[PDB]
Amino acid sequence: KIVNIGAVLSTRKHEQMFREAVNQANKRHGSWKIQLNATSVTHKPNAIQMALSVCEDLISSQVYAILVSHPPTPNDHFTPTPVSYTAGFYRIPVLGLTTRMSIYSDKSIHLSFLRTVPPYSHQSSVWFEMMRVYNWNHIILLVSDDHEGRAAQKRLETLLEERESKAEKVLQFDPGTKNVTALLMEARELEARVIILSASEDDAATVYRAAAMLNMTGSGYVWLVGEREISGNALRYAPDGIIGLQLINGKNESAHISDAVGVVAQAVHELLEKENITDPPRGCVGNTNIWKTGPLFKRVLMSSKYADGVTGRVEFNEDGDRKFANYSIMNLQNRKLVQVGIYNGTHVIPNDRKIIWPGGETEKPRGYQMSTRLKIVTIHQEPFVYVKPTMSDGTCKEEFTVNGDPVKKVICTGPNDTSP
Amino acid sequence: NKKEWNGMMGELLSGQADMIVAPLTINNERAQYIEFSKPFKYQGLTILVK
Amino acid sequence: LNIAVLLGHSHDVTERELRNLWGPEQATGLPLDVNVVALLMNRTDPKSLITHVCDLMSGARIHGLVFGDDTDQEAVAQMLDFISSQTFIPILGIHGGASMIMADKDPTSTFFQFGASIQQQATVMLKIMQDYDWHVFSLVTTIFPGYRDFISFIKTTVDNSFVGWDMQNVITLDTSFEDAKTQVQLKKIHSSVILLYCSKDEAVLILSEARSLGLTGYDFFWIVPSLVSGNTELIPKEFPSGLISVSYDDWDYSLEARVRDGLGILTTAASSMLEKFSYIPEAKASCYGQPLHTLHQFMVNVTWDGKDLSFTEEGYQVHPRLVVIVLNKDREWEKVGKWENQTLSLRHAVWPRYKSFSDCEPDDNHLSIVTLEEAPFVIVEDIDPLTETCVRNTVPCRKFVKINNSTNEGMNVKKCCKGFCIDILKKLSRTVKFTYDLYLVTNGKHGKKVNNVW
Amino acid sequence: WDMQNVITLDTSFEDAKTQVQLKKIHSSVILLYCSKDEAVLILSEARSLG
Amino acid sequence: YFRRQVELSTMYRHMEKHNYESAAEAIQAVRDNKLHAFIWDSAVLEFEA
Ligand SMILES: *[C@@H]1O[C@H](CO)[C@@H](O[C@@H]2O[C@H](CO)[C@@H](O)[C@H](O)[C@H]2NC(C)=O)[C@H](O)[C@H]1NC(C)=O
Ligand SMILES: *[C@@H]1O[C@H](CO)[C@@H](O)[C@H](O)[C@H]1NC(C)=O
Ligand SMILES: *[C@@H]1O[C@H](CO)[C@@H](O)[C@H](O)[C@H]1NC(C)=O
Ligand SMILES: *[C@@H]1O[C@H](CO)[C@@H](O)[C@H](O)[C@H]1NC(C)=O
Ligand SMILES: *[C@@H]1O[C@H](CO)[C@@H](O)[C@H](O)[C@H]1NC(C)=O
Ligand SMILES: *[C@@H]1O[C@H](CO)[C@@H](O)[C@H](O)[C@H]1NC(C)=O
Ligand SMILES: *[C@@H]1O[C@H](CO)[C@@H](O)[C@H](O)[C@H]1NC(C)=O
Ligand SMILES: *[C@@H]1O[C@H](CO)[C@@H](O)[C@H](O)[C@H]1NC(C)=O
Ligand SMILES: *[C@@H]1O[C@H](CO)[C@@H](O)[C@H](O)[C@H]1NC(C)=O
Ligand SMILES: *[C@@H]1O[C@H](CO)[C@@H](O)[C@H](O)[C@H]1NC(C)=O
Ligand SMILES: *[C@@H]1O[C@H](CO)[C@@H](O)[C@H](O)[C@H]1NC(C)=O
Ligand SMILES: *[C@@H]1O[C@H](CO)[C@@H](O)[C@H](O)[C@H]1NC(C)=O
Ligand SMILES: *[C@@H]1O[C@H](CO)[C@@H](O)[C@H](O)[C@H]1NC(C)=O
C-alpha cells in the first residue's frame, strides 16, 4: 500500500518543496489507504560510485519513479545515463528534467526514459514556423554535434517533406577545429543567407568570431540561433540584431518539480485502478528476473493527459516529448536582450516591440540574391566551342571573319590534356 | 554501393558550376534529376564513313 | 597484455578450455607479458558487472575485457558501453545480449561488438530481393523505435540501386491497432513481398491480422529481421511456415572460436600499437578516487589468420557472417544460406514454394516449365556483371552445372534468357496471368527412349 | 466485352478469402447482385478497401 | 540511349572494346581508315563534310 519515489536532488529547500508536493499530492485524492514515500540523494563529484550508490539505494528502496534535477553542474557531460540504464534493466521509467540531448530520444538505447522537455530539433519546427511567416525556402545548415546531427537532418527532412524543397548546404564536422571559414565562404557565395546553427557554446563563439572577422554579419545575413548559442562567450561574441529563442521556465526548477510530482502522482493513481500489480524485487542480490509490467506501465504513461500546472498542457507524443510549449523569441538590440515574439504550440505572434535587423529596415531582409555572375561550364565541342591558345599573355587575337563579323571571344579557363 | 555522377553533371551537382551551356542530349534519366529548358538545336543521328 | 574474459552462461561451458586458449595461441608473441584471466559468472545483474570491473581493473591493471551473454537483455551491452566510457578500456561483446545491436556509440567509449547491424542486414535483404527480381513490394513500419533510420536507409538504397524499385507507400502505425484506420492502410496492400520492422509481441498481432485479412497467401511474402525473431525454442503457432529471416547466429562457429578470434584481434592491435608507441599499457588504478594513445580508431585495419575481421567506423564488423534462414513445414528455423565477404552465397538457389502455409489452403496455380538451349529460340546468356540483374526482356533461369565427373555434386548457376520462346512465354504470362517456374534441363537433348527410359 | 471472372460469395464474409477475390478487382465498373441487407456490408467492405 | 534499347545488347557488347575519349579521336582514327562507322549528331558531321 506504499509507493516509493526516488530523486537525485541537491538543495534542501527544493527537497522540502518536493516533500511538500508529495504531502499535498494526497490532499484531493481522498482518504484512500495508499502511501507515498520519497527518497532523495545528494552529490558526489565522481560518476561511477554515484551510479553505484543511487542504483543500490533505489533497489533497496524499490521506487517507481527516478528524477534527476541538476541543471548547474560544473561537468559539461550532463549524463544521468547510468541510473536510467540500471532502471531500464528492470524497465522502470526515469523522468529526466534538465538535459535536452538527442541521445535520450532514442528509445532503443534508453528503453525506459521519459522526459518533459523536447530536444532542440523541435525548435527547427519553430524555425519552420519562420518559414510559415517570413516565406523563406533555401537554408544553410551547420551542425557540429554529430550525436544530434543525424536527428537534426532527419527532422529537417521531415519538415521539408511537406513543401518538397531541398536544403542548399549541410555541414557536419568534428567539434574543436577552427579553420571552417572556407565552407563559410562557400556558403557566402550561395544565393541564400539563412544560417541554422546547432553546436555547443565554443563552436558557436568560434563561428561568431569567424563571421565577425570576415564581415558575414552585414546586410541581409539571416541569423537564427537558440538558447545554447546565446550563453557564455557566445553571447559576448554575438552581433547586435541576432534573433534567438528562450525556454519559458526552462531553468525554473521549483514549479517544474511540482509539475513532475503532479504527473507522477496522477500516473500512479491511474495505475492503481487496474489489475496485474507487480513489484520490483531485491535485484542487488540474487534477483535477475525483470519487472513484468514494464511496457504495461509505459503504456500507462503513453496516454497520460494532464490539465494542471503553471506551464500548461503537458502531453506526451509517441516519443514521450512535450506538447504545446510556450517559447519566447528574443532579439539582441545593442547588447541587450529584447523580447520580440511569443510562441504557443502552433503559432508565432510578435509582441508590440519592433524587430530591428542587423542590416537595413525593420522589415524582413530578402536574403535570396541570385548569382549575377553565372558560372558557365562546357565541353570542347568541335564546331561549337573553339578554344585557341593565347598569343602573348592572356590575350585574344581579335581576328575578323569573311562576312565582316568580329569574333567576340572570352577568356575561359581549361586543362591541357587528360589526367595520365 | 552508391550512385554518383561525373563530368559536367558531376561538376554541376557539386555546386562548383551554375549553368551548363552545351549541346545536352535530352533524355528521360536526366529529366528526373534536373529541370530542362527549351531545345535550341533540333537534329538526329547519322553514320560517319569515308 | 593482461586480458580478462568473463562469461555469463547457463549452458555448462567450463573454464579450463579458456586456460588452454593461452598456450598454443599467439605463437609469435610480440608483447613480452601476455596473461589471461578466465572467469565465469552465474548472475546477470549490473551490480556484478560493476563489482567484477572494479575487481579486475584493480587486478594488476587488466587492459582487456571480453564478455559473452546467454540471456535476452540488450541493456547489458549498454552498461558495458558505459563502463568502457568511464574506465577507457577496450571491451568486446561476444554472444547474446552482449552482441545485440545498439544504435550509436560515443568517442569516449571503446566498446565493440562481434555482430551484424540492421543496416548491413537490410543491405543483405535487399540483395536477396534483387537476386529474385521481387521488385514490387511494400513496407509496414510500426512504432518500434529505430524505425525512421530504417525508412531513410531504404529510401537511400532504392535511390542508389540499378533496380528502380516499385515500392508501395509506407504503412505507418500510431498505437496498438484499432482495426479501423490501420485497416484501410492494410487493405491498400496488393503486392507480394511485405517488409516489417517491429517487436515479437507486436508481430503476433500483425500476423493475426494478416491471417484475418488473408495476407498470408502463396503469392504474398514475409521477410522479418533478426531482432523480432527471438529464441529458437519459443516459436508460437501463428508464424507462417516460410517466414524469411536473416540472423548472424551461426551454430558452426562456437563461442570459443569467437573469443579466440577476439583475443587474436586484441593481440594484433596491441602488437601493432606497440610498434608505433612505447608506453602502451595505461589503465585506471581503482574505482575509488576523485588518455591520448587509444585503440579506438587504430584497429580498423585488422586481419586475423586470413579472416576479414575488420572494424567499421560505427564499431561493428566490416564483413560479418550473416545466415539466411526460413521456417519449414516442421515449424523449425531451417538453416539455408550463408554470406560471403560482400557477395551473397545461396546453398538453396532453387527458391522453395512452401505453398501450404496453413492446412486449408487449396492452391494449384504454379506451373513447372523447362526448355532447351537453341539459338534462334532461347538465347541463353550470362547475367550482366554491371547490374547483377537480368534486363527487362530477359528472364532468369538456373542450370545445374557439375564440377567434374568425379562427383555428382554441382551448382545451380543462374543465367539470363531471351529470344522467341521467352517472348511467347512472357505474352502467355500477360494473357493468362499465372505464375511460372522456369528452369533448364541438364540430362541432354529433346528425347530418345533407351529401353523404356526417356 | 472485357469481363473479369465472377466473384462468388459463400456465406457472411470472414473478410479473409473473399478479400482475396476482391483484391483481384482491377476493373472500373463493378456489377453487384445481392439483397438489401448484404449490400450495406458489401459497400462498407468496399469503402474499407478503397 | 542504346542501353535503354533492350534489343541491341550485341552492339552494346561490341562497342565497349573501342570507345574513345573524344570525338576528334574518332575523326582522326577514321581519317587513317582505321574505323568504319560512328554514330553521331547530324549537323556537326554535315559541317565536317
Ligand atoms: C494558442 O492557443 C489558442 C487556443 O487553443 C489557439 O487558438 C486556436 O488555434 C487554432 C489553430 O491555430 C485555430 O484554428 C483556432 O481558430 C484558434 N482559436 C480561435 C482563437 O479562434 C492559438 O492559435 C494559439 N496561438 C496563438 C495565440 O495564436
Ligand atoms: C521512507 O523514506 C525515508 C527517506 O528516504 C527512508 O529513510 C525510509 O527508509 C522510508 N520508509 C521506511 C521503509 O521506513
Ligand atoms: C583558419 O582559421 C582562421 C580563423 O580566423 C581563418 O581566418 C582562416 O581562414 C582559417 N584558414 C582556413 C584554411 O580556412
Ligand atoms: C568588412 O567591412 C568592410 C567595410 O568596413 C568591407 O569593405 C569589407 O568588404 C568587409 N569584409 C568582407 C570581405 O565582407
Ligand atoms: C519561477 O521562479 C520562482 C522562484 O523560484 C517561483 O515562483 C516559480 O518556480 C516560478 N514562478 C514564477 C513565474 O515566479
Ligand atoms: C493480467 O494479464 C493477463 C494477460 O493479458 C490477463 O489474462 C489477466 O486477466 C490480467 N489480470 C487480471 C486479474 O485482470
Ligand atoms: C502559454 O501561456 C499562456 C498564459 O499563461 C496560457 O494561456 C497558454 O495556455 C500557454 N500555452 C499552452 C500551454 O498552450
Ligand atoms: C600543353 O599542351 C601543349 C600541346 O601539347 C604543349 O605545347 C604545352 O607544352 C602543354 N603545357 C605544358 C605541359 O606546359
Ligand atoms: C554464484 O552464485 C552464488 C550464490 O548462490 C555466489 O555465492 C557466487 O559468488 C556466484 N558466482 C559464481 C562463482 O559463479
Ligand atoms: C594494414 O596493416 C598491414 C600490416 O602489415 C599493413 O601492411 C598494411 O599496409 C595496412 N593497410 C591496409 C591494407 O589497410
Ligand atoms: C572476398 O575475398 C576475396 C579474396 O580476398 C576478395 O578478393 C573479394 O573481393 C571478396 N569478396 C567476395 C567475392 O565475397
Ligand atoms: C574433370 O576434371 C579434369 C581435371 O583436369 C578436367 O580436365 C576435366 O575437363 C573435368 N571434366 C569435366 C568436363 O568436368
Ligand atoms: C566427363 O563427362 C562428359 C559428359 O559429356 C564427357 O564428355 C567427358 O569426356 C568426361 N570426361 C572424362 C574424360 O571422363
Curated annotation (Swiss-Prot), chain A:
Extracellular side: 1-420
Subcellular location: Cell membrane; Postsynaptic cell membrane; Synaptic cell membrane; Postsynaptic density membrane
Top-rank taxon: Eukaryota
PTM annotation, UniProt: NMDA is probably regulated by C-terminal phosphorylation of an isoform of NR1 by PKC. Its phosphorylated state is influenced by the formation of the NMDAR-PPP2CB complex and the NMDAR channel activity.
Intrachain S-S bonds: C55-C284
Tissue specificity annotation: Detected throughout the brain, in brain cortex, cerebellum, thalamus and olfactory bulb.
Glycosylated sites: N37, N179, N215, N252, N276, N326, N344, N416
Role according to the record: Component of N-methyl-D-aspartate (NMDA) receptors (NMDARs) that function as heterotetrameric, ligand-gated cation channels with high calcium permeability and voltage-dependent block by Mg(2+). NMDARs participate in synaptic plasticity for learning and memory formation by contributing to the long-term potentiation (LTP). Channel activation requires binding of the neurotransmitter L-glutamate to the GluN2 subunit, glycine or D-serine binding to the GluN1 subunit, plus membrane depolarization to eliminate channel inhibition by Mg(2+).
Subunit structure: Heterotetramer; the NMDAR subunits are modular and harbor tiered domains that function in concert to regulate opening and closing of the cation-selective ion channel pore. Forms heterotetrameric channels composed of two GluN1/zeta subunits (GRIN1), and two identical GluN2/epsilon subunits (GRIN2A, GRIN2B, GRIN2C or GRIN2D) or GluN3 subunits (GRIN3A or GRIN3B) (in vitro). Can also form heterotetrameric channels that contain at least two GluN1 subunits and at least two different GluN2 subunits (or a combination of one GluN2 and one GluN3 subunits) (in vitro).
Similarity annotation: Belongs to the glutamate-gated ion channel (TC 1.A.10.1) family. NR1/GRIN1 subfamily.
Domain topic, free-text comment: A hydrophobic region that gives rise to the prediction of a transmembrane span does not cross the membrane, but is part of a discontinuously helical region that dips into the membrane and is probably part of the pore and of the selectivity filter. The extracellular N-terminal domain (ATD) is a site of allosteric regulation to modulate overall receptor function.
Protein name per Swiss-Prot or TrEMBL: Glutamate receptor ionotropic, NMDA 1
Origin species: Rattus norvegicus (Rat)
Lineage: Eukaryota, Metazoa, Chordata, Craniata, Vertebrata
Residues of the full protein shown: 25 to 444 of 938
Curated annotation (Swiss-Prot), chain D:
Regions annotated as coiled coil: none
Localization annotation: Cell projection, Dendritic spine; Cell membrane; Synapse; Postsynaptic cell membrane
Tissue specificity statement from the Swiss-Prot or TrEMBL entry: Detected in brain cortex, olfactory bulb, hippocampus including the dentate gyrus, striatum, thalamus, superior colliculus, inferior colliculus, midbrain and cerebellum (at protein level). Detected in brain cortex, hypothalamus and cerebellum.
Superkingdom of the source species: Eukaryota
Subunit structure, interactors included: Heterotetramer. Forms heterotetrameric channels composed of two GluN1/zeta subunits (GRIN1), and two identical GluN2/epsilon subunits (GRIN2A, GRIN2B, GRIN2C or GRIN2D) or GluN3 subunits (GRIN3A or GRIN3B) (in vitro). Can also form heterotetrameric channels that contain at least two GluN1 subunits and at least two different GluN2 subunits (or a combination of one GluN2 and one GluN3 subunits) (in vitro). In vivo, the subunit composition may depend on the expression levels of the different subunits. Found in a complex with GRIN1, GRIN3A and PPP2CB. Found in a complex with GRIN1 and GRIN3B.
Protein family membership: Belongs to the glutamate-gated ion channel (TC 1.A.10.1) family. NR2A/GRIN2A subfamily.
Function: Component of N-methyl-D-aspartate (NMDA) receptors (NMDARs) that function as heterotetrameric, ligand-gated cation channels with high calcium permeability and voltage-dependent block by Mg(2+). NMDARs participate in synaptic plasticity for learning and memory formation by contributing to the slow phase of excitatory postsynaptic current, long-term synaptic potentiation, and learning.
Domain topic, free-text comment: Contains an N-terminal domain, a ligand-binding domain and a transmembrane domain. Agonist binding to the extracellular ligand-binding domains triggers channel gating. A hydrophobic region that gives rise to the prediction of a transmembrane span does not cross the membrane, but is part of a discontinuously helical region that dips into the membrane and is probably part of the pore and of the selectivity filter.
Protein name as annotated: Glutamate receptor ionotropic, NMDA 2A
Organism: Rattus norvegicus (Rat)
Lineage of producing organism: Eukaryota, Metazoa, Chordata, Craniata, Vertebrata
Segment of the intact protein contained: 198 to 247 of 1464
